[PDB]
């Protein structure tokens, strides 16, 4: 019952829909698109022990979107990946889903609403730490300029938060918000000040440094924009409210882009699986799961001056014009040097124009949380990461690589 | 209270077209998707298209070539527009909630209807 | 295009009686049926979704039940308030939401 999906357009259903569905099924269905392309996924009907997983991905290799099992239709699904794939899961127990794909093409500033106010980004991928009590402020109604209430915890503390998982890994540049006035008693209430934590995974989090406290809103009605020093690369985002006037309520929405919109910047296969276990190697280890190098997909990573080295097989040769490299699941890469070959065998370090030598890039200053390095185009099939300085606990990394076809 | 509470006119002359409003309380449509759907004597009840929550449309395949949807969600709005009526576009047209932010459900409420009589 | 057949334009009852209006899919629709009561001068309201689950506020007299091809909306004890315009519907594939023709019910007094 597995199968790929290559054309513009298409559907994909549980066997036998709308017949009742067969039991232990173990079905993969994957769409595959052409770089500059977007995979558009929309759920029509769902009816399911027995789950459906939605992977960024190859299944148990790229990230897990979601997990999915009642009769509620997951929420679409706007890929720029290259590949996003389902896993439907059966049992014997008494027991589908109708889904349709679409394939389109994708001054350019970093600065466009990732959407919340449009609802791109759905209820589901909205929660708080809590809600006010008469549910008239729930999470989902933290939308700017929404016309009914806004989100309200039950408690006013500087421990709450609301969250928004973007599902994909994306570029954050801006964050804006409005408090709200009350449709019951017309009372104003607003955030005067907030912090922003951020993280890969939902697990793993950091709280955003300049902890940068962001001067928020002084009424209850105005949009404030606070622009990022840098932009972020991060899928899960967390407002925690410091200070407010008369009480916390937020409407909010968040700015940026994908990696992809720049130019020549498609990951090439280490975070979705494309570039395969067999594919990826390295100096040394501590014997190894080639997976574990994989940015935010592993739950680890890569653990073995400038001696060591991770290594990417792209497959065919393409422009390289960056790497994503991210911290281990506690130590990171801070300063590193990469190489480059189009046979395997001889390779040549990427210079530095101003210096005239093998470029030093700076790493991480965080386990988690990404950070995009780039650098003049050059034809490549074969990439080395080598770490050169490092935390105190040690080299520990994930790994991803930018580029395209060549040209 | 859920309401949907329908805006249009009741005349609208050949070869022109027909706006409708939809304006909803009680729910946000980031919540829940809105179809329409008309009702004449020869045809019975016909759906038309639909919005769900975020922006994304389907429209019948027979009124795909002149049907537009849209919202406004800072004020809960849906917006019906079709293009060239013609005598047999004459009925009564109705804006009903979906019974989920997205997916094919059931339409739980519906607006009052709006009469649209095609004519010169 | 799927079709939703209600072969009873019309029928007879009589407050307190059973009533069992039918409706049959061209093709398999599963579970993706509704049904809606229409009075005269009124929009429709939901009574059933998903073949055979009663909408929140509907009363109990109104069951639905059905799958594959074959649905039927059971009236379990008729009231004058009763008198409408039924319709099932399915939802099941594209094209969406294609209607049955209507069952208008009379009562014997």
């Known amino acids: 019952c597995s199968k790929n999906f290559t054309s513009p357009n298409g559907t994909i259903e549980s066997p036998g829909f709308p017949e009742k569905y067969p039991h232990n099924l173990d079905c993969t269905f994957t769409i595959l698109a052409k770089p500059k392309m977007e995979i558009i996924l929309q759920f029509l009907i769902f009816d399911l022990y027995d789950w459906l997983d939605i992977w960024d991905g190859i299944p148990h290799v790229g990230p897990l979107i979601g997990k999915y099992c009642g009769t509620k239709t997951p929420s679409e699904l706007r890929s720029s990946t290259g590949i996003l794939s389902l896993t439907f899961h059966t049992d014997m127990a008494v027991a589908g889903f109708s889904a349709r794909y679409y394939l389109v093409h994708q001054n350019f500033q970093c600065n466009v609403p990732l959407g919340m106010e449009s609802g791109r980004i759905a209820n589901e991928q909205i929660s708080a730490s809590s809600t006010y009590s008469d549910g008239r402020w729930t999470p989902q109604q933290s939308r700017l300029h929404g016309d009914d209430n806004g989100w309200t915890p039950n408690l006013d503390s500087n421990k709450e938060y609301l969250q928004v998982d973007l599902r994909f890994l994306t570029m954050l540049t801006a964050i804006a918000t409005q408090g709200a006035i009350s449709r019951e008693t017309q009372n104003g209430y607003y955030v005067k000040s907030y912090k922003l934590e951020v993280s890969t995974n939902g697990e793993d989090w950091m709280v955003y440094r300049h902890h940068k406290v962001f001067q928020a809103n002084n009424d209850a009605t105005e949009v404030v924009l606070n622009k990022l020093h840098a932009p972020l690369l991060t899928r899960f985002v967390r407002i925690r409210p410091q200070t407010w006037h008369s009480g916390i309520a937020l409407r909010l929405e968040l700015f940026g882009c994908r990696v992809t919109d720049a130019p020549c910047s498609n990951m090439l296969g280490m975070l979705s699986g494309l570039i395969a276990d067999s594919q990826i190697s390295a100096s040394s280890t501590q014997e190894w799961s080639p997976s574990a190098a994989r940015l935010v997909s592993s739950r680890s990573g890569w653990f073995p001056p400038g001696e060591e080295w991770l290594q990417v097989d792209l497959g065919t040769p393409k422009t390289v014009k960056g790497v994503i490299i991210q911290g281990a699941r506690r130590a990171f890469v801070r300063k590193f040097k990469v190489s480059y070959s189009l046979n395997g065998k001889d390779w040549e370090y990427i210079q530095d124009p101003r210096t005239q030598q093998p470029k030093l890039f700076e790493g991480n200053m965080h386990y988690d949380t990404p950070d995009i390095r780039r650098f003049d185009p050059i034809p490549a099939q074969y990439v080395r990461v080598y770490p050169e300085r490092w935390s105190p606990a040690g080299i520990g990394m994930r790994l991803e690589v930018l580029g395209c076809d060549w040209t | 209270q859920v309401q949907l509470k329908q805006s249009g006119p009741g005349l609208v002359q050949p070869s022109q077209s027909l706006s409708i409003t939809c304006t909803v309380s009680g729910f946000s449509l980031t919540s829940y998707g809105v179809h329409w759907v008309r009702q004449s004597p020869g045809k019975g009840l016909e759906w038309l298209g639909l919005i769900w929550s975020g922006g994304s449309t389907d429209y019948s395949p027979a009124f795909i070539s002149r049907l537009s949807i849209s919202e406004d969600n800072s004020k809960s709005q849906v917006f019906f527009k079709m293009n060239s009526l013609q005598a047999d576009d004459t009925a009564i047209y109705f804006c009903?909630?979906?019974?989920?932010?997205?997916?094919?459900?059931?339409?739980?409420?519906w607006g009052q209807g709006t009469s649209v009589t095609v004519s010169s | 295009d799927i079709v939703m057949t209600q072969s009873q334009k019309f029928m007879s009852t009589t407050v307190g009686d059973r009533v069992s209006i039918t409706c049959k899919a061209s093709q398999n629709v599963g579970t993706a049926v509704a049904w809606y009561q229409q009075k005269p001068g009124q929009s429709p309201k939901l009574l059933i979704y998903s073949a055979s689950n009663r909408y929140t506020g509907v009363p109990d007299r109104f069951t639905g039940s059905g799958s594959g091809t074959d649905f039927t909306l059971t009236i379990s004890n008729m009231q004058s308030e009763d008198l409408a315009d039924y319709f099932c519907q399915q939802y099941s594939s594209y094209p969406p939401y294609t209607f049955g023709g209507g069952t208008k019910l009379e009562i014997k007094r």
């Open positions: 009903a909630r979906n019974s989920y932010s997205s997916g094919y459900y059931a339409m739980d409420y």
